[PDB]
Structure formats: C-alpha cells, structure tokens
Amino acid sequence: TPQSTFTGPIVVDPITRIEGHLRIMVEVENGKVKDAWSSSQLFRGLEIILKGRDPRDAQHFTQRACGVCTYVHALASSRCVDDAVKVSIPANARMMRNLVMASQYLHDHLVHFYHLHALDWVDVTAALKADPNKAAKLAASIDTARTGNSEKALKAVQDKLKAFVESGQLGIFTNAYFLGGHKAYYLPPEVNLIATAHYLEALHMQVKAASAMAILGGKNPHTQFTVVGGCSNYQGLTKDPLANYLALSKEVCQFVNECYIPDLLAVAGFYKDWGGIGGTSNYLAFGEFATDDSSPEKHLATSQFPSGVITGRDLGKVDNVDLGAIYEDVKYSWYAPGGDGKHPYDGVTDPKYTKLDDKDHYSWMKAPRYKGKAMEVGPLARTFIAYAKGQPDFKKVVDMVLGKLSVPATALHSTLGRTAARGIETAIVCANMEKWIKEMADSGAKDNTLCAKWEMPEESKGVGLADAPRGSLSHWIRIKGKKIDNFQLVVPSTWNLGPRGPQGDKSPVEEALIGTPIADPKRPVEILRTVHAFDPCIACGVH
Amino acid sequence: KHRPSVVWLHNAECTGCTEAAIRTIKPYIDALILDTISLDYQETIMAAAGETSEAALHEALEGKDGYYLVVEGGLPTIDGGQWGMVAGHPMIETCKKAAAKAKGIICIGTCSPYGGVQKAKPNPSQAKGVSEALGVKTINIPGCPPNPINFVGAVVHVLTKGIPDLDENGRPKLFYGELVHDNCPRLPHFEASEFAPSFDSEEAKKGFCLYELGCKGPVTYNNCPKVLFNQVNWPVQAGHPCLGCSEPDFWDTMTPFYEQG
Ligand code: SF4
Ligand code: SF4
Ligand code: F3S
Ligand SMILES: [Fe+3]
Ligand SMILES: [Mg+2]
Ligand code: NI
C-alpha cells in the first residue's frame, strides 16, 4: 500500500543483515521498482585455490566458503569426493550427516528470521509504546501459552530496551529505517514488543541449537567430523551424547513452535500485501534427508525433502533434475569473456574485474541457468516441489498456513511466501528430529560402523548434491593424477542472487525486485524485505 | 561513552567469526551488547542499510570519545583493493581509515590476523593480514573460527585491564599459550605409540591417537581441548584430527590435512 512517487535510482550498499557483501541497484518509476541489479562485491578464489590439491583436503577449504551455512559445504564436498572415489558411505554416516544438516536448518532459519529479517517488519522503538499487560493478552491469544510471553516478561524486555535507548548509544539500531516512524511498518506496538522479546530469546536459543549440532559435528561454527567414506565421530553414535542431542534439539523445537511460527504467522497477517510482491516462476531442488545417499541419483530420488524443477509456476508438472542441464554463464559477471555456458564439470574461474556499476559486468557471482532459465532455489522451491508431490508433512503445514492466513497458495509465489516457507520447513525438520535420532541411536548401538574403506583413483569425477538452508548446492570434481584438476561449486545464493545470464535474463532476486513499492526512497525497507526473504549469502555465492 | 564503542569491520571473510562471537556465553551476546560495549557498526546484524549504514559507521569513527576496531577477514589487495568493496570503497581503504584513530585493534579469526584462506596459494586476490596490510601490531585471536571464549575474553580484557600478554604472533598468551596436543586427552596413546591407521579401523573406534591421520594438535597453539566448543565438543573428540587452524598460513603450512608432511 504505502508508495512514493519517486522516480530515479536507489542503491543500497551495503545490504546489511545478510551474509557477505552485496550492492543492490534499482531504477524506480513512481515509487515502484522497474529494473534491478544484484552486484556481489567480494571475490576470494576457493575454486582456484583448490586446483592441484589433495581431494581429501577439499571439504576443509570449501567449508570456508561460508561460516553461516557451516558444514553444508564440507558435506557437499564429502559427497562429491565419495562420488569421484566411488565409496558408499555406511548407514550411520548417512544418518549422522543428515542429522547435522537438520541441526543446521534449525539454527540457520531461527537466526535468519529474528536477527536478519525481522528488523524489516518490526519497529523495535514502537515496542517502547506498547503496554505489557495488553501485549501479554495478545500473546496469550495468538501464541502457545508461555511463561516467556507474560506481562512481567514483556515488561522487563521493554524496560531493558527503554534504558538502552535512553542511553543514547543505540548501537545496531543506529539509523534504523524505523526510527521516527516509517509508513512501511504496520505492526501494532504490542506485536513489536512480543517480537522483540523473542528476538532476544532467539539469541540464546541459537546458542543452544549450535550446541546440539556440535555434539555430532565436533563443533560449531565449522564442523570437524566428516571424512571421505563417512564420518569419524564414533561417540556421536552413543547413548549419552545422543540423549543430550535429543534434549537440546527438543528445546530448540519448543521455541520454533511457541515463538518462531506464531510470530511468522503474526507478521504475515498484518502484511498480507506482501503475498503479492516479489514472486518468481521457476524452482529447483536437489532434495535433502535422503534414505539412500549412495549416489546423486539415489539422493535425488530418495530425499524425504524431494527433488524437482517447477517451471512457469506449473505445480502440476514437477520435472526431474537433469544434472547435465545445469550450467553457468559469466557475461554480466566479473570474469573473462568466452566462459558463458559452462557445465560445472567444465567450469572456468577467470576473474576479470571492470568497474563499479558497469551494467555489462556487475557481479563476482556467475549466473547459473538450468535449461536456459533462472531458477529460484531454497525453502519456497522445496515447499512447492514437496507439496506438489504430496509430501504429507508439507501438505499439513502448508495448508495450516494457507488456512490461518486465508490466502490461496498461488500467494506463496512472493516475498511473503518465501519467508513463510522457511518457517514451514523449520516446523517440519523439528517434526522429524525424534524419529531420525532414534534410528541412529538404535543403529549405532547395534553396530557402530561410521567410515567405509575406499581408494584414490588416478582419474575420476564426481558431484556432491545437497539442499542446504538456502537451496540447491552442488560440488563438482575432476580428479586427475590423484589430485584436483577442477573443483567447482554452484551454490544456492548463486542461483538466486547471481546477475543476468548471457540472454540478458534477470536472476530470481533481480526479477523479484521489479514491482517493489518504495514508500520512502530515503529509507527503502521494501528493497531489503525482498532481498532478505531470499536469505542472501554472498560468500557462499561467490566463493 | 557510557559504554565503550566497538566498530566491527568485515573484509574478505566467511562470517564464521561473527557467528562464533554470538556462540559466546559468559556473557551472552545481548548482554555484552546492551550492558558492556556499544557495538556501533556490525553489518551482519545492524538495522540500517545502504547510506544509513555508512552514516552509522561515520558517526562511530567520529565519536566524541574513541572506539575499538574489530577486524574480520583479510584484505583483498589486488587491483587497488577493488576485488573487495563496501559502500563503493575498497576494504583496505576503509580498515586504513578505521585503524587510524582506533583505541585498539582486535583481529578476530585466522583470516584477519594472518591473511586467511583467501591468501592460500595461489592467492588470486592477493589478500593479506590486517597487520601485513596496515603495518601495525594487532591483537590476534586466530582460529577458523576462534573460540568465543577467547574473543569475548580478549575484547573485555582489552577494555578492562588493557592490552593482554601477547606471544610472537600476537595471540593473547592466556589462550594461545599451550599446545592443543599437550592438553589432548589422547596424549597417552600418542606416547604409547598407539595410532589410528584409518577412520574405519578398530584403533579409530577405540580412540587411538590421530597423529598418523595427520593431527596437527602437536604443532598447534590453542585451548580447544581444555575449553571445548559450545560447551560440548572439539575436533579430536569427534574422532577427527586437528587442522592446525589457529596457526598462521595454516592453509599451506598444514595442507595435506591427513598426512604428517
Ligand atoms: S578465520 Fe575462518 S571462520 Fe573466521 S572468517 Fe576466516 S575463514 Fe571464516
Ligand atoms: S590426537 Fe592429536 S593432539 Fe591428540 S595426542 Fe594425538 S597427535 Fe596429539
Ligand atoms: S582444527 Fe582448530 S579448532 Fe582447535 S582442534 Fe584444531 S586448532
Ligand atoms: Fe549457503
Ligand atoms: Mg562457481
Ligand atoms: Ni552462507
């Protein structure tokens, strides 16, 4: 609804509350975005740095592509070399690798919703205006009954914030787009207070969630338990650790349900206008939580969170992923010419910077295209594909959401949709922990086999597939001389936030940005809302 | 001011160190932020964006009373430092600025301290440590990432008591004083010459030393076995060898992670 008459360009650099360095440049006609550019600002190397190195070392270098997405790259890389090496990891390895990823989904989506996105819909300063007693009643009407949503709990939150604000040292809230009131912020002070109480709560809950992951993963950030052939964490297979793991996980899930989801639904109710802003057509998923992780084909097919490629927004046709169809162009990217259209196994990373705001060359991320088209990857892609396939859990939850929100489903094709999807699957991963944990607790107890024997090939090639918290992740390798000849990563954020392909075709984010309403060009919260819904990770994207 | 002002910079990094900072308990992140310091710039969690974020930055550095500089990530040096940019400025240029009047400089992570993974061969961006780049002594809290216990520890200590005792590579001796291997609960196996030959072998299931599998704990300085991560674990206890990540240039100095040379 709120929208200026602003005509001219606006650029947000840096895009904060995302991982990595991103510059967004849009052209606005009468308060609505008419064109957009997604400019990734830092290049590290990684793929280049890995050339000629020992295949066993790759997981360690690639895991550093990102510290938010921790483990997923070590996983993707382990699956990749397991492929080139032709090793079939044991049952317990699959269970433990898949369990750590679930733990990661848990920690990642909680932090992203509260610490990264929330500030785009919630006005923390207006939480100062709400009466705690009136707030607690609302909390008692909209959320699960919790001692944390009490009059006194909310009050203390308000008293903590108040003092801080009245200190004059605003810190991270310095210059916030919501300071002074902002026409884009609709939530009533009561909900601003509730969300802000839960924001601080999630700072503590996320510690506890990263602690559960570290039991199985060695430590967080940057797990140290996977090895070519399986895992090395024999103790993660035992009674006490698993018991503890199960405990922390349970406690993280209580928050997901009492606070996370309710909040998400709350924010969604007030901003239903966002169910019609920033949508895309194509969705891709390599899937996750597979029952037969013995090969990429067996991963795609057996994933509890299924695979598929939805084109147009044809939810009646979820096609199968053709790994040979995936490729990446470098036309509008900061790489040497000649390399547009390379399949990962033949990828080429030749950095060649030009200048800022070139339009012809504006990002360090490549432009991954599927069979000529851009693909949105991540929670919304997963939800859509999973739902289209009749995945029970997804049906229940998506319908519970579509219902409580009284919107269609066609409504998910948007920023509001993308945002809710991330929550919807958090509720589902939480729904599966006990089950998954019991399987491994039982398998481990019977036989603790965690790593298979394998042998280094002179020449080989493999691919590691995974659907990390932000989408479709694949690590491709070409072993030659028993060393790394080529190692290429095509990451979720590269799909969503890379620039245009050689056809001049926009990426998912650039497409989602068109039509974005700017209530106030000086404080463009709307741009950030769409951008954060994608959960951008520029380090992951560029590597 | 009433709370000391800390300005946090992100350069060539993975954000694994901002993530590690928030894994701290004793104190928890919010406490440190609301009660102790005044984190005035931190792109990962700051509300303002775009010009507003840079205004916030400016304000911090122009602060009536100083600031402490926390640098995360190495500096992209190639092509005038243009391969790493923020607000349309090169990262070097901006650390140069912030370090200039900084009451103190704390490098969080092996990247800022010593150049990092981006500096690993062949180092396409020609990245380097904040120290090598600026040419100033910095308080290094290495690790990939460092233990929050060590970071928060150094921050607080630097704000209260002053600059801590540093070793030859700038690491507070308090944390980077003892070899990982020296506190490793697997030392008896290492002494007894009881090594795990493979991660699938019985020795590995039995908890045998991981020296044969390339454990660099013997040449690594850090408090991981003593302190643990997340109050729950650490690499060697997860049956996996130490990569020597708290060591300078470890990416090329510890390279064949699963071999001893
Ligand atoms: S030192 Fe490691 S964890 Fe820290 S930013 Fe660098 S690569 Fe990431
Ligand atoms: S496992 Fe490693 S750090 Fe521990 S005793 Fe062995 S060589 Fe030392
Ligand atoms: S890999 Fe690093 S985290 Fe400690 S166990 Fe080793 S110095
Ligand atoms: Fe990622
Ligand atoms: Mg790539
Ligand atoms: Ni990431």
Coordinates of C-alpha atoms and ligand atoms in Angstrom, one line a residue, chain A residues 19 65-70 73 108 470 491 493 536-541, chain B residues 14, ligand 6:
Chain A
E19 CA 26.0 -12.6 4.8
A65 CA 33.1 -20.5 1.6
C66 CA 30.7 -19.7 4.4
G67 CA 30.5 -19.6 8.1
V68 CA 26.8 -19.1 8.3
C69 CA 26.0 -22.1 6.1
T70 CA 28.6 -24.1 8.1
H73 CA 30.0 -27.2 2.1
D108 CA 20.0 -21.1 10.4
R470 CA 19.1 -21.6 1.2
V491 CA 25.8 -22.5 -4.6
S493 CA 22.8 -18.0 -3.5
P536 CA 21.4 -14.0 0.6
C537 CA 24.8 -15.3 1.3
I538 CA 27.3 -13.6 -0.9
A539 CA 30.4 -15.6 0.5
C540 CA 28.5 -18.8 -0.5
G541 CA 27.6 -17.3 -3.8
Chain B
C14 CA 33.0 -16.1 5.6
Ligands
NI6 NI 26.4 -19.0 3.5

